[PDB]
Amino acid sequence: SKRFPLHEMRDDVAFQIINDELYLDGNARQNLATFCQTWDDENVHKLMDLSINKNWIDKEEYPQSAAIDLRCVNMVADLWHAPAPKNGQAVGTNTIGSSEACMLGGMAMKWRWRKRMEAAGKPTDKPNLVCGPVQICWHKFARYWDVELREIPMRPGQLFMDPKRMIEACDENTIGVVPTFGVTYTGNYEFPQPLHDALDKFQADTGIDIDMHIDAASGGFLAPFVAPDIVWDFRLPRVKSISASGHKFGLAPLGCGWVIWRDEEALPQELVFNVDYLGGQIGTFAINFSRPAGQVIAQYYEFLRLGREGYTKVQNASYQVAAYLADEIAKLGPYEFICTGRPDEGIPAVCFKLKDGEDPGYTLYDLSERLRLRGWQVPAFTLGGEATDIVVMRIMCRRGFEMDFAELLLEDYKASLKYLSDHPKLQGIAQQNSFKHT
Amino acid sequence: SKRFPLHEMRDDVAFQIINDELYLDGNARQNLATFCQTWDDENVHKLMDLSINKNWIDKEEYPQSAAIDLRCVNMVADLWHAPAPKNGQAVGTNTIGSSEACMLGGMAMKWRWRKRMEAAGKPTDKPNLVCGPVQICWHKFARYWDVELREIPMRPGQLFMDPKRMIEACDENTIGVVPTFGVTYTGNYEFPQPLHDALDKFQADTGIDIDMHIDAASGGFLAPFVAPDIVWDFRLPRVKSISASGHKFGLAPLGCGWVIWRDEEALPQELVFNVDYLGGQIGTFAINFSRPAGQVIAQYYEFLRLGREGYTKVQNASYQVAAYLADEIAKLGPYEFICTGRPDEGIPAVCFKLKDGEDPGYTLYDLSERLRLRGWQVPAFTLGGEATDIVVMRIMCRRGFEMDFAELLLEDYKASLKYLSDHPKLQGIAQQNSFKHT
Amino acid sequence: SKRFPLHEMRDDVAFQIINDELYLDGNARQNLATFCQTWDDENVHKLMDLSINKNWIDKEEYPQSAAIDLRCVNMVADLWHAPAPKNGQAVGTNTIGSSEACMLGGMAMKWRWRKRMEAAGKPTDKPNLVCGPVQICWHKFARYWDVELREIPMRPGQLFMDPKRMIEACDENTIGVVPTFGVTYTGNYEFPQPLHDALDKFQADTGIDIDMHIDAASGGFLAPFVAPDIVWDFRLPRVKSISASGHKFGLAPLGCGWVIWRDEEALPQELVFNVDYLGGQIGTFAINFSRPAGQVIAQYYEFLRLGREGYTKVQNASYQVAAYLADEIAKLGPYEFICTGRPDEGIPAVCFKLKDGEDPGYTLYDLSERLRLRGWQVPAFTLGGEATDIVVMRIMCRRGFEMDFAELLLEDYKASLKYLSDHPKLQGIAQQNSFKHT
Amino acid sequence: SKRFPLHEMRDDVAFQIINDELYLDGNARQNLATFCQTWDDENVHKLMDLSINKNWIDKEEYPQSAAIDLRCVNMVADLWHAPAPKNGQAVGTNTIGSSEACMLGGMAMKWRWRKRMEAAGKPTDKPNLVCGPVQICWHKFARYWDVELREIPMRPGQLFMDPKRMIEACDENTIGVVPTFGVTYTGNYEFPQPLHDALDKFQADTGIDIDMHIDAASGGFLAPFVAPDIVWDFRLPRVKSISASGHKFGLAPLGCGWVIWRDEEALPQELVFNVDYLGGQIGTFAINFSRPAGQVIAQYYEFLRLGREGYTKVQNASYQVAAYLADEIAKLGPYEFICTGRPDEGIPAVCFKLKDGEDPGYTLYDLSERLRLRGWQVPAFTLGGEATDIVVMRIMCRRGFEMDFAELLLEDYKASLKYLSDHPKLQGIAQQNSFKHT
Ligand SMILES: *[C@H](*)c1c(COP(=O)(O)O)cnc(C)c1O
Ligand SMILES: *[C@H](*)c1c(COP(=O)(O)O)cnc(C)c1O
Ligand SMILES: *[C@H](*)c1c(COP(=O)(O)O)cnc(C)c1O
Ligand SMILES: *[C@H](*)c1c(COP(=O)(O)O)cnc(C)c1O
16 A cells, blocks of 8 residues: 555556556546646657657657757747847757746846856845746745745736836846746736836846846747737847746647747856767756657647647637637626736636625635536636735636537536525635646 | 748648658667666556646646555655655655756755754855765756765776765765765665765764765665665665656656655755645645656556566566676676676676776777667766776666577677777777766 | 538548547546446457447348357356256347346236236236336336336335235236346345245235246346345246346446346247348347347457356455445444445445434535535435435445545545535535436 | 356457457448448547447436437437427437337327327227338337237339328328338338328318328438438428438448437327436436447537538439449349339339349349359348239448449359359249348
8 A cells, every 4th residue: 555565466457457546537628727738639649659768868869859859949939039049059948847947047047147246246145036926836946046036916906017016126136037928827918028118227227137037838839829919029138038838838748848048148058068979968958857758749740730820720719719708707797807818918718706895696616616516627716915815717728628618618607606596505615726727 | 940830731741740750769779878768568658648638736637646646655665664654645756857856855955954054053155065976967956056066086996985085075064965876877886874874973073964865866776676685775864865767777667756755854844835726735846847647657557567576576687687798798808897787786787997908909989889880879988087087888787678689789799899800990989978878 | 500510521520529528428437326337348348349330130141249149148047047948049138228128028028918818808908017116117118018007115114115015016907026136226136035925825815826027137147146045036936037237237338238038938929020031030029120239249258258256256346345335434424224235135335314313414415415526426316105205325336446446435425524514504405316327 | 058157267368269259240341231331430430439338328427428419319300300499409319220219209109199089089999000111110119019000012013102002091090100211122212292192181081180200210311411302301291200220321330210209299298207317307218228329429420520511422422333233233134123223212222123924044032142152142032012922132332332342243243144044953942031121
């Protein structure tokens, strides 16, 4: 049970035991809380099966996996408008996910800032990072790398880091600013452009030059296709690096993330380690070492098969569903929407709360429980900062969640409302927050 | 081939294109350089295929995957003699590999050390780490977390960190010592026991109490089965944590690593982050967030199917082949062996060099090249520290590399020698280090 | 939107669309309400796949499928102690399920009765059928064939047809008595032996000769293996026919039923239809005509693979889990058990209710809902007969639901109780019967 | 050796034994006697495999299977011009085949009649059913439900139920008329419109109001696509119900039938039974209960993939081949055709007999045997009624039977004729009817 087994067991019996237990896991098709891919593609399955033993770090034994990874780095860099590479190869790396990507970005950000302060003869004893309602990976970064996290707290009417409060927290100890292009909590984009203008003025008034790292975990694979006019990437001079989750809207299977740097200068060479290989040593900047290359290969398949044309069609379908749900749900209760699935505002999500004062006879926690009985997982949870007095419901519309599935959700939603009305004693009982990806 | 594709392509054409390219990767069956699993098991393939979308961090949607992970943690802790958990669950976590596991162990060391010094009213801005010929992940750890790496260099006579030099580098700023229970370069174990005795005396003399973290990337899944008497794990009081690679001798597919802590006190809770889940929040101490659970499930399959009984047989087979090759190769040239595949000395590997002042007409680099033309990748490389000019050949004997495969290698080895003798001009031409996992 | 589609679409697109929505169906591994097979066997999947086009009624084109069906009929007849047939072939047939099998048995009863009456110059326009708490297929039989259904009502302290009330309902117009060897509602066996004794005495006293048809939908593939001493089958003279569901404890996949007659005399030939075939016409007594032979083939696979000893082990495991749950659940509340998974009393099920006048702060309907939120479907429903006031919870233990899953259920059971205790306003809200197979 | 096996057997041995004997079944590709699907589609195989455990009656655990079934009901009703449903859902149900469907239609018909007679103060103990050369399922219906079958006999000139002889058999005890829209014996359609006009006149002259149930086992999925203007469905007032076989020209795998009622009024609610489900009770009118939902899912796949335009193409291909064979075979002997594969007269079949008084030196029975030696099963059999002295050959052209298969059949046909000519003693030897689906 708790001990390492003493004796053997027939291969097929062991497989039989485990296979039967796994049916206890959900298939997530009715899970509207997660951001990760849950759609099945036969080709992706075959590519992953073929790559179970392909070692991502062994560029000697698996040269083509390595080659494909480099093409991916170039493509993502291009998608984000990185300046043309002098050597023809963009500066970036594949990672397990946005978490590792963000940490690599954070470290580079801290290193640049440090070397800069040292060149000015200033102490590098107490660095700080300015950001909004960031995902937990940034809290780990601040803690693990001894950096003071200056999180602009959420607050009624302004659930994001705005220019004014951002500047209020910036000083010579700020290694950089991290806008979240697709806030986990709500689905809305923190727009880098306005923040960028503020940083320019800041330099003009104080001489302090601050860089940006965009945590585009979700938005990095959305805006480029459905809202190209939004300027949030390398088109902005201060953006030295950007990270995103391939396994979210990048459409790759779980285990794929990306981080790109503006140019060679943006990435401190002190953070790159050379590794010997027969064809010459190659530098790597990663937290991991041995790991499978299947997700990189699957990511490439998605790029090759879809292109901008196909990604636009896929993301457009998600936004269409999200907008549909936002419009229909609005008609069923006294709700105040925070996100409505608009391409120009954020990701394909619907986030709302009960209007202040309004009491329809149930909280969102109660509604979430009723829906769970219908098989749906629609997360309800309290926000942070100075808005912890707010309870919201967030619906994520991923690939595979078609219009007809949304129609069914609406029927169950209405059925859940009718039930809550018929049984008033239910109101107020549900009090636990669901998994919200952070 | 550099920019993100503009137009889409037929799914099957995209697959066909990538599939054809992948034949350029090797299958590693004749690669005797890598430590990672290269053997195919139909059941492992099925479990992995079933888990492509199972999110390791989403304990809510995939509860059984989470349950299986916890069983593995307990089993590994048991295998390493961890003290009985007061709450029934061992303290530890699954990782992508030994690199992440080592970083988590390192940070824990750094944190325990901190609170130790602060308590004793002493500064904490100049920490250092004492170790031997460690794998690159530790060099990354030192650089990324600003810790002074005090690596005891290899030298003709002792290519490992010995008790004497270890104490010489130890002081009040030593956050801990890291013995490598299975040195990447040679395959030999750095025995923790002697170093442990030295650490107790160091405390009895200076009052300084230094702990250890065992990097058992390879050895953690070897000694427990074929050399139980070697005391290197939690049986030693100073060992507060141990890490190992499941995808190496743990026999799991690429993407699995483990780190276990002696008990709750060994892991600073300041490094643990809580995440909300409908069934209550759960603490996680990891660098990654979203990622697939298939490797954990496959690891469990190996534990269940093999048990101590099955692992002993698998590892015994490897040691058998290693010892055989060591015995037969010694008869082919003037060699000095560093590792001969002995269960009591290290892992299933053969490592040797030409005897000092002995020129047989070829270097090990030349031999490696002849073998490469015969399909084998047997790495030749220079050591580090004060042995920088020593060239060695290291042969890894993994699951799948059976006796008849070793017999073929010997025939190719002898043929390579005859060719080198018949063509003296080849001597000294090859000079590049092969991939050596570090 | 729901009209017959106008245009064609790509084969793989249509499949993709349907495949994706099928995830909305459950996998039933945590459904403890159904009696049907939910376990998966690769060999069964292969046999079914190979038989997709094998026509059960076309004995000419698919002679081996026909041969296999006949072997199954002989094996089932043998299992139920049917008298040895003169021509070497038992009288009986495969069906889609117990429903069709019961109707065939019902028609035969009605026919034997009619002929009996006609021979004695008695009217045949007012036939009735005596039974206990039968599954809905008998209510369908009564209505479709105009037979007065005399169902002995369940009542506190006697939820089954007892000898006394059975006789009270019998007369000259009774076509037969249907004991239910495994009552759907509770899982308990209605023992034929005592009822048979009553029918013998009834004949001796009134001259009325009444026969039985045993509805052994579940019990037919249980008692023969774990309680062979229970005399419920053909060993009893009045039992003219027996039916059972191969897809329940017969372990066959959905779509397999069986009905066996005592001998040629038990099956009126007026009900058999001869169909022309090259090798000679063959009689058929069935409601269906064209249909696949896959389930018959799979049933045969189960017979050959397991045999008596195999089935005994499979059923024994289910009885263990059931007895275990009954034993453990009793310790968690003021319950009165109706069925506790004892082999000598019924099927592997647990059925209970709250003790009269006892109020633990919840109804079983509330507990069922809490368990649903934890992924389990454990049906709670009101009884039939004259007990539509009593609410019970029934747990079915099928193949695949092993001990460890039962342990998990207990953990969730206890967790549900605690939640109900900490939230008393939940009491009495839930009030809808779950699917209970009738 | 016919008993229930005693010991277990290795799963692989049991599978091997059975797999090897199944090769004794034919693959039916050269069987031109059957109406059922014998074509293989990988997507249908995948869908069926995924649905092995999906319980058609458990709408609670398998809600999507249930929802898909309802879509199919609506689509088939639309295809047959059923009046728009007030509640949005057509009245009808999936069945295992046309046999069950016909019995359901038959019972409903008997009930509607009974209600009418009771209100009229007339006896209801002598019901009769008027029909033509119906398939065996109606003979079963008549026997099982005690209804007098008034079958208009086949006779030279008219091998079907004509208006005049239909009316001559109709009286106040007639529960209805059953036209066969695709006669099993000949492939010819019995046109409902002419019969309908006759029933209109019958009511005008006698006040006796008689309805119809169309047995469109084969024609129900043909005429709507290739002969839209044939008025045989709900477009006709007296048509209260229609049934058809999905596994015949509906292109679904074995185990799928359909029966649709004109409206709620056409279906006596006393024949519907309610079943409890967590989401509310749902009524069912079926003979069977538990069974797999795979065929329903596969039928939906065919509807979605093909649509009206696709079915038209598939059906046209079969008719093209039928017409081709009819035209060619006529040039090979003194034959009188009954069916020539015309879309406006019937299904894709070829039916013929030897001209009266003509003796080419062989009977169709002899020709059939010769073709069997060449791998073809082309049934030859005697008709009934007043044509008991007429022997015909019927060739069915199903999906998969391409033009080149037909060309091969013709070569073998010619070869068989030559052989018969060279061996005159063969004439008259063969005298057994083949399987003809009835
Ligand atoms: C999901 C998310 C992350 C974490 O990315 P992973 O791929 O899960 O490691 C980081 N930031 C934001 C804003 C996210 O939504
Ligand atoms: C292989 C190795 C590592 C790195 O482990 P990964 O599983 O590749 O991350 C670390 N330390 C040693 C001693 C190793 O051999
Ligand atoms: C399940 C059941 C039936 C119906 O059997 P099916 O195989 O679903 O047709 C009939 N009687 C009893 C007692 C049952 O439990
Ligand atoms: C084939 C046929 C039937 C029987 O249909 P099944 O799907 O085999 O139950 C009934 N009537 C006619 C006219 C048929 O051709």
